Amino acid sequence: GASKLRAVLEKLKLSRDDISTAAGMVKGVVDHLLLRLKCDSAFRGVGLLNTKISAPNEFDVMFKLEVPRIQLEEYSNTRAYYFVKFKRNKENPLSQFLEGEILSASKMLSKFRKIIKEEINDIKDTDVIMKRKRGGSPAVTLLISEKISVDITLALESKSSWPASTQEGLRIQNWLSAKVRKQLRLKPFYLVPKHAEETWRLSFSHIEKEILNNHGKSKTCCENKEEKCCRKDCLKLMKYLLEQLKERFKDKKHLDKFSSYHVKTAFFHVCTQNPQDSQWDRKDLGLCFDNCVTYFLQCLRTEKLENYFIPEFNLFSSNLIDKRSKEFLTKQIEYERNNEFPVFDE
Amino acid sequence: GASKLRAVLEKLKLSRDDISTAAGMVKGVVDHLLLRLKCDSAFRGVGLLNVKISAPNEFDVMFKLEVPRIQLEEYSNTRAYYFVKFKRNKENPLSQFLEGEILSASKMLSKFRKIIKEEINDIKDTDVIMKRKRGGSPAVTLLISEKISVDITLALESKSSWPASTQEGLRIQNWLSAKVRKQLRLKPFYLVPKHAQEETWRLSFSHIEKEILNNHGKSKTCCENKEEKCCRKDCLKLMKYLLEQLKERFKDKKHLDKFSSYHVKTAFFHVCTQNPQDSQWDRKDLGLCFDNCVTYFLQCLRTEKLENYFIPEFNLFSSNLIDKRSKEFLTKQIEYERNNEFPVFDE
């Protein structure tokens, strides 16, 4: 039961050296790209975010870009996507991407993509290739040595206050404090050239890393033997549940629209519903994991999974995931839950 | 006469080491399960209650589970079955077995059973197997070494006042005192996932049944010295044994298979209420005391009425539970055995 989950966690720990070595490779590439990018006038002042691992051998890196004070205009009533313009009119090196007053996502995403392709080639160090993951992605993906993939995402940084669609987001007040929510909302936010064109959408993955690492009601959660909670183990288990299922439905790829981010997002909502560290005692691993699985289910059947930061933005909208894929994954997860997770067997 | 019953008690003493070893096996198994269960979030706080030996090779164990303050709602007008809900609306790990406000018996019984099934298999200690006894049973039954069976019953514990259906039950005042009944009624009561409707639980008072059996005299020192040896325990043994011997003689059509030692125990407690003095149970008067027990059991069969000692409006001999034929059949055999100095105790 709970002893089964621990066996899965032990199993996952085995490929910890294998995912570190892959990461060593990813770092070298990133740093190299980071230097050439600074030689471009538009991209000097580029840097690495978080000051990484979605799945085994799938890596995620963000390139922050310090940008002059930004005027945001909300596209349609999509609560996440925005037109970008400047609030100065002496002109700056991003003017080659302006169209009117609007900063072109796609034009900047196109040169960003171009510079990387340029650096890929003269590299005789290794075999790296460009590939496009899916339309829409603000990420440029690389394949390192035909086994490791890296999502490299361009990100504009805005130090001004978070937009109004985030007002009721980040409901961490009863879990982490109200004052932590204030401290976090003083931090920058990011805009990535994901269109849904000339649109950018909000990204808060730096806060995501932060609430994951600093995750307890107690400031000393997981800093001593008396406060070992199972939040991280539960997210590990959720991600792994999804990946196993995605592989078992490899024939017709019914589940290929779901990702670790849906899982991570739902896990954050569960932390909000269960704000006490006593609710994540490692002795209750089986039950805590069950709490995460039941909430993910309710999300699938209700077809509603709200962005943690942007509550009116539903990640499970029919516009993103078809109604059939959701009903299908509900059936699967329901079954696995009703039978003590056969996908975690042997 | 009285010597024939004594011979039977002596014969039964011969298999005292044989059932003690079997009980030793049962304990080891139960204690093993008790630890694995405490690793589960919903079942930590589980323990052993204390009734142990229903039959010569049938064992009965209860697993108590401390539960926060319990709201009961009586199902239909059944005086024994109840819905279980919490008076909390912070919630405890039984929250995964909820449906609305109601605590599901079947949902909790199914994880209990499922946890047990898991420990049984990887056990290389012996051949232990799962079996379901009968429809309705709140028990998970095990078979040890293909000879010994153990009823393991989950039981919620409530430290609140006994429900109203019990108000006229436990009529022990003239036998054990009015003050003993007050003491016992301050003790917890239990709910077992015996369903009527798979979300119901019914009441259990077997801990109280043990207490009045062991502590059974009007005199506090009954059976603590040579001057006070009563035959209460002996009469219940003979009664159980009578039922078991008969159930074996009708091995053919299984005519008596609705009856169990619990009816006999239930009926013996009524006879105690009727004979409250230790002098009505002198060991010299064994044949006569034993007759009192058999006539009353007959009257119950013939009147088709055997009320639960704790819940008087709950009739165990109702046509709803045992058919009218089976009762009339057992009345015949018992009438015959009583009329002929109990031939089933011969040789």
Ligand SMILES: Nc1nc(=O)c2ncn([C@@H]3O[C@@H]4COP(=O)(O)O[C@H]5[C@@H](O)[C@H](n6cnc7c(N)ncnc76)O[C@@H]5COP(=O)(O)O[C@@H]3[C@@H]4O)c2[nH]1
């Ligand atoms: N590496 C990377 N960083 C991103 O920010 C991101 N956003 C999208 N994608 C990938 O682009 C494609 C377009 O999907 P879309 O945007 O419509 O919905 C996305 C997106 O709205 C949301 N999502 C993913 N990452 C983030 C994120 N960091 N912040 C907010 N939302 C996100 O959850 C959906 C599923 O994402 P993925 O299935 O894991 O991959 C997507 C997809 O392949 C991303 N890939």
Ligand SMILES: Nc1nc(=O)c2ncn([C@@H]3O[C@@H]4COP(=O)(O)O[C@H]5[C@@H](O)[C@H](n6cnc7c(N)ncnc76)O[C@@H]5COP(=O)(O)O[C@@H]3[C@@H]4O)c2[nH]1
């Ligand atoms: N180990 C165990 N503990 C129980 O509480 C219990 N309750 C029922 N059963 C078994 O489930 C089945 C359903 O019988 P039912 O409920 O209709 O009538 C039962 C029930 O009304 C009552 N009875 C037996 N044990 C108890 C008990 N501990 N408390 C109250 N009543 C009981 O007398 C009848 C005959 O019981 P059994 O024929 O020996 O075993 C029963 C039966 O196999 C039990 N088995």
Ligand SMILES: [Zn+2]
């Ligand atoms: Zn912690």
Ligand SMILES: [Zn+2]
């Ligand atoms: Zn006595």
